[PDB]
Amino acid sequence: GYTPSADNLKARETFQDDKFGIFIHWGIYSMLADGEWVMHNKNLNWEEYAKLASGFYPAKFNAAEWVAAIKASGAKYITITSRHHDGFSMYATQQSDYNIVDATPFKRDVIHELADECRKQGIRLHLYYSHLDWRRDDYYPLGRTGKGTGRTTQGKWEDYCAFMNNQLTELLTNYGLIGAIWFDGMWDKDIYPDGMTAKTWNLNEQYTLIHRLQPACLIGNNHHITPFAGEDIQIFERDLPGENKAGLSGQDISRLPLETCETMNGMWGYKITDQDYKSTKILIQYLVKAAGKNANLLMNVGPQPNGELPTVAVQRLREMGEWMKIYAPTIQGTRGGVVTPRDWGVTTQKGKTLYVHVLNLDDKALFLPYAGNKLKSAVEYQSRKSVRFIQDRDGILLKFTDKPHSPDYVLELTFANELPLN
């Protein structure tokens, strides 16, 4: 079956080292400013919806400003929508004239500009690509969604698979190195009996094509189930691995590198009525919790129809970056800690070092259930002040002089041996 290349293994380890990326959902739906699902939610006719492209002009778009504001947060990569459910391509494809260059007065390939700036600025580029299409008539038979977009013709599914293959080829050919392909949407056909099989979705052909073009490119698929052979990362939508508070998960944690995706406000695409952006404290803690469960955090912003990133999102990214300036070594380059997440916080680890991230504790002591490795020292990460501890065969007890500050009271524990990997 699938044995991943060595460049692919390095790519997985670098991805886990990086820990933090930014999601970008941008399209012509940003004009309606009611979320990226508006075409299906309001049952918009595909022709009338497509008429919006000839008025799309994000005049204030600036790839350099975007990538700079994201880099400033500590994030190391950007995952951007190359084509979402509405079928509109945000790059210069030759498989359809329904794209940013040919169908709008903007006439610019924004994915190419962003790739150039990511190269220049040391940020890796990941591409989201939708298996689901609400406009094309060769997406036949239909799944659960999209029955109200006014399609009145049928094509062959083979033609749609060819279309996807050629678009994937283009994206892996004209834009430099691509960190990952992020498939989404096959959950649409989970109503038919064979709706989540690799053969209906042509997954083996597609994955093999991807890895032939760029063997170090990682593949993830947001299907919410057990990863298919060929995927290089596992995705959890709006939940940490092993949690299901949002109801879109519940699948077993595989052995692939893990990534949790989340929105900074409540919606992926720009939504003018949704201005409730999570606080900087919440976002820092979300990243720390992700890292403590051995997962990356892919945090989303939805660009405005004038081309700017929301100002509040840029503020949050800058404040997260101020925090990262001090604490990134306790997150980036680490893995999930030997003590798994607890109500008080989490732990990350690197070599012989265990970082204890105390996120939610008002007592002045903390029990760590870990034994068999001589603890040789404990200090506060920032101040370097020493932390009193008692170690025995049952575990470790840390005692604090003050009881802890927000948003993260971090202790650095140094052990004699190891730290293990479960």
268 binds ligand FUL (CB under 6 A): yes
For residue 116, say whether it is annotated as part of any ligand binding site.
yes
Which residues between 100 and 129 bind Zn ion (CB under 5 A)? 116
Nearer to Zn ion, 116 or 137 (CB): 116
Question: Site map for Cl ion, 267-306, x if CB under 5 A?
Answer: ------------------------x---------------
Return d(Cα 280, Cα 275) in angstroms, integer: 14
237 binds ligand FUL (CB under 6 A): yes
Least Å distance, CB 128 to ligand FUL, is 7
Nearer to ligand FUL, 36 or 232 (CB): 36
304 binds ligand FUL (CB under 6 A): no
Name residue 253's beta-bridge partners. none
Question: Residue 223 touches which of Zn ion, ligand FUL, Cl ion, none (CB < 5 to 8 A by kind)?
Answer: none
Nearer to Zn ion, 89 or 300 (CB): 89
Question: Residue 93 touches which of Cl ion, ligand FUL, Zn ion, none (CB < 5 to 8 A by kind)?
Answer: none
Which residues between 358 and 387 bind Cl ion (CB under 5 A)? none
Question: Residue 268 touches which of ligand FUL, Zn ion, Cl ion, none (CB < 5 to 8 A by kind)?
Answer: ligand FUL
Question: Residue 65 touches which of Zn ion, ligand FUL, Cl ion, none (CB < 5 to 8 A by kind)?
Answer: none
Near Cl ion by CB under 5 A: residue from 278, 335, 350, 352 = 335
Least Å distance, CB 108 to Zn ion, is 12
222 binds ligand FUL (CB under 6 A): yes
Question: Residue 291 touches which of ligand FUL, Cl ion, Zn ion, none (CB < 5 to 8 A by kind)?
Answer: Cl ion
Return residues touching Zn ion (CB under 5 A).
116
Return residues touching Cl ion (CB under 5 A).
291, 334-335, 348
Return residues touching ligand FUL (CB under 6 A).
25, 36, 184, 222, 237, 268
Q: Which residues are annotated as a binding site for Zn(2+)?
A: 112, 116
